Design an enzyme around this catalytic site. Structure first.
Site, short mmCIF file in Angstrom:
data_model
loop_
_atom_site.label_atom_id
_atom_site.label_comp_id
_atom_site.label_asym_id
_atom_site.label_seq_id
_atom_site.Cartn_x
_atom_site.Cartn_y
_atom_site.Cartn_z
N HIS A 55 -7.77 6.68 -0.18
CA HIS A 55 -6.42 6.14 -0.19
C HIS A 55 -6.29 4.90 0.68
CE1 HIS A 55 -2.18 6.27 -0.95
NE2 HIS A 55 -1.87 6.43 0.33
N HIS A 58 0.85 -1.19 0.00
CA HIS A 58 0.00 0.00 0.00
C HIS A 58 0.89 1.25 0.00
CE1 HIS A 58 -2.45 3.13 2.22
NE2 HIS A 58 -3.04 2.99 1.05
N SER A 59 0.62 2.17 -0.93
CA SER A 59 1.18 3.52 -0.96
C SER A 59 2.71 3.41 -0.97
CB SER A 59 0.57 4.31 0.20
OG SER A 59 0.71 5.73 0.05
N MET A 60 3.42 3.96 0.00
CA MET A 60 4.86 3.85 0.00
C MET A 60 5.36 2.38 -0.12
SD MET A 60 7.77 5.21 2.91
CE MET A 60 7.46 3.69 4.14
#
Lengths: 280, 284, 284, 283
Positions: B261, B100-102
């Site tokens: 997000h 997820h994300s980073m």
């Protein structure tokens, strides 16, 4: 008091102090796997200068970095700035050899308000690498890390073999000997060349050619660059063309990569250029 | 009868915390969470993916993982080494990444640097880092050096009341209450005032050297394994036409889903929506 | 409605510990200390039954999920006492009580005798004083300690391919199967061959300097607070029958119960027995 | 040709600094300094002990040796372990100890605990540590723990002027030349001037003292010859308990005029200690 520890928050470094305490503030940065005695011959011929000859992390008598930490160029640059702070220096000059010169260029281009001038010996920019090969280089670096705990530290049962080991990797006997005095560590067998195994690791990410060109163009202070006619320009004549595009004061001199340490003669040659430079 | 679910994983340079999901014989997966989040990022999604041995890792400086030693950096490829070392310490040869994300960005770097090691990539609402070109790199390094000199001065907020700490995690639809509560259980630490969002001040620092745009593109074009990327309809990536143009030149499978997000954490329906994509993807 | 915090890191200046939190935030503050090589789940049956109390079940350094000590640090009984005192400081606790099993009870007594203005109450499970050693053997003992320190690089930790072989390994360290299981959830770490009982090799070292018998008795005499002592019929008194007589010289409340050394963890019946004692004692 | 005089010794848990004195093939000796001192404590004495290879070791937290890691103690037997590991790192099995003050106390502990390793003791104005009995031990542990909690708050003095930092060293008695010798290895640059490089934890009280019976048991377990130099009017020389104790011990005593730092204060004082120890290392 000519020999101190300098305590930074993250690491404690060693340094040798040359010249008078009222002199012009200079930090002297040595090359890969060397140490402060690289300025044995040269520091004492630059009177008027208060020269702190710093052992980089993991070299000479400076501490090894804590676990997990890198030995990248800008990590040295941060160390050097924090040495300056710990001394109470605001503006200072950098005297640099080989890798030390490269670290000096980065600091000067990143923090032009802090650097008064650069005195560089046979070093300017790092070996570079482009974006197309970067995924591949990171992968090499990640694999080299998995092997880090198996790295070797050679042992030399007698000192003279330690000195000549250093010549085959090229400098004079007096230079090797001078480095060995700060550079050797007793182990059961005999002496070993103190170093941090991580210092042989490949970088996870090289500067591109454009990065290096930008750093060198961001320098705002005067620069005096001594080039060994038997040194770096013997190994990389594409350097010649880049040097023509730059304002740095260039002096080509006889001798090899360590011309400032090999000989009294080389050192006196280097000192006269830099003494002139520091006086204007 | 017995199930080990929370462990430390000892790397040579740092000790990390991880939560284990799924049968020990499932396909090997390491799940990587987002910046200043933790393993609980996957608390709804991982139980829904029932063929998979998921090692939900806390990145250094996060959750219950150790902080890095003095002087160590928190750069993307630092996390990438750690993740690889976690695979070593688990005895994994090949393994998949769920990010997820980073954590998606770290996954992409790892996969592009070590294609032989990564079987699959399941990415949630992340792909490439913010990039910086060489013309600003000197100024960026000056900023990083200065930020390091000034780092001494930063302090961490203390919430006397736990509901205040959850509420500070939401600060008007970016993440749900349930999502901040789940993260809070693994992300808070008692202090004399009450509770703090456990973190390392150095995670504040600017990078000393951003990847260039060319670097980011070379990593994403070096990914050789199947990739399934999920984009949040009410996030930024699904809106960036520069993201659409990039994905269109790549073979990664793409799915958009309702939510923000943190859509895989905010509620059961989001987690199940995401589960539907990744469970089919991993079942090939 | 709100999810509460049950598992945390506790940041001390020199080490970071793990703790499990039991009970109401406004409960009477108690730190629970476990035995050598055990961990906080030593209290998994008992803490939930102590309804009034805010129990911080601490992993000692080098145990459970707390960090190992930094390079060169010792694991002497008084090093644990400091960590416990610092934990209370980090929680903002002024006065507090201790609930200690085995080595944890020993540390509790050292602390209560050294700093009586902070320990309100001691609840002790089948532990009191350490093994002691007199001055005539001290040079020899230090010599042994120096030799063991030199030989420490060569210590290694067993690896169990099978979760259930790691559990049985703990049953011969005597203790019920469910107790070994309970501790294994917090005590096992994934390694390449499987699972290891997470520990620090330094915990095998002999003390460089043992407390003399007089030391031990003065630490015991110096306790100022009420003390509740539980004595397992097959525990401490069955091993050291000299102990019975020392206890008759102390104002500690004594409750004799069945079971072994881990009577509070072996089974629900030990935990219920122990809890009714301590719950009475803490209400006074 | 050029010789290695200043060195780093790598132990598994810490990295120490040392000055190497004398012939490579000399009688192996590790030299140990006193509390808050460094290896410059032997700057005058060691050059005068010509048959000996003297490894003048900076104790952890002193001189140029590293500070211990977070949470680690500075107790007499942590120094003893370090000295032993240094001997291992040098490849020395049997070796001698030359100890000043706390250095002498550590040396006695090492000899008494590992008679097989220690060939001689040359001790300067040090023998046993202050002791404390069991009946005070809880009070002391509690003082030690309260000291730990408050350590955070102490900050080290900073001397704008180098000589003001030296003069501070002078407050037992010690000479200006001994102060300046110690200050060359013991001072570090700091934003506002200079500070005596030291670990704050060096100020903490012990959690657990040796009892009188421990100390006696250690001195009486020393199986090797020892040469003890006393300062004529020091507390070790004149207190009736130390004289009485020392009369029962097989150690070669010599009372000499001078302070606690008589081997460092002046060349005369160093020569006097050299003569004794030179003879003692010759037999």
């Amino acid at each position: 008091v000519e020999e101190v520890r300098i305590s930074l928050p993250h690491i404690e470094l060693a340094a040798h102090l040359f010249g008078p305490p009222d002199g012009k503030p200079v930090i002297a940065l040595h090359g890969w796997l060397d140490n402060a005695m690289s300025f044995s011959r040269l520091a004492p011929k630059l009177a008027g200068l208060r020269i702190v000859a710093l052992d980089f992390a993991g070299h000479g008598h400076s501490a090894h970095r804590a676990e997990g930490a890198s030995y990248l160029l800008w990590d040295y640059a941060l160390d050097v700035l924090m040495v300056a702070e710990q001394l109470g220096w605001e503006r200072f000059s950098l005297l640099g050899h080989s890798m030390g010169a490269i670290v000096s260029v980065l600091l000067a281009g990143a923090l032009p308000e802090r650097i008064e001038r650069l005195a560089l010996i046979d070093g300017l920019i790092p070996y570079t690498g482009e974006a197309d090969k970067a995924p591949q280089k990171l992968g090499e670096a990640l694999k080299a890390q998995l092997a880090l705990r198996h790295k070797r530290k050679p042992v030399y049962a007698e000192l003279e073999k330690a000195v000549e080991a250093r010549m085959r990797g090229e400098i004079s006997r007096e230079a090797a000997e001078l480095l060995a005095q700060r550079g050797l560590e007793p182990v059961p067998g005999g002496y070993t060349w103190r170093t941090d195994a991580r210092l042989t690791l490949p970088s996870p990410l090289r500067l591109t050619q454009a990065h290096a060109l930008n750093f060198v163009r961001s320098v705002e202070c005067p620069v005096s660059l001594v080039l060994a006619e038997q040194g770096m320009l013997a190994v990389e004549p594409r350097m010649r063309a880049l040097l023509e595009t730059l304002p740095f004061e260039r002096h080509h001199l006889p001798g090899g990569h360590h011309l400032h340490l090999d000989d009294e003669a080389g050192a006196q040659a280097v000192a006269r250029v830099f003494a002139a430079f520091f006086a204007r």
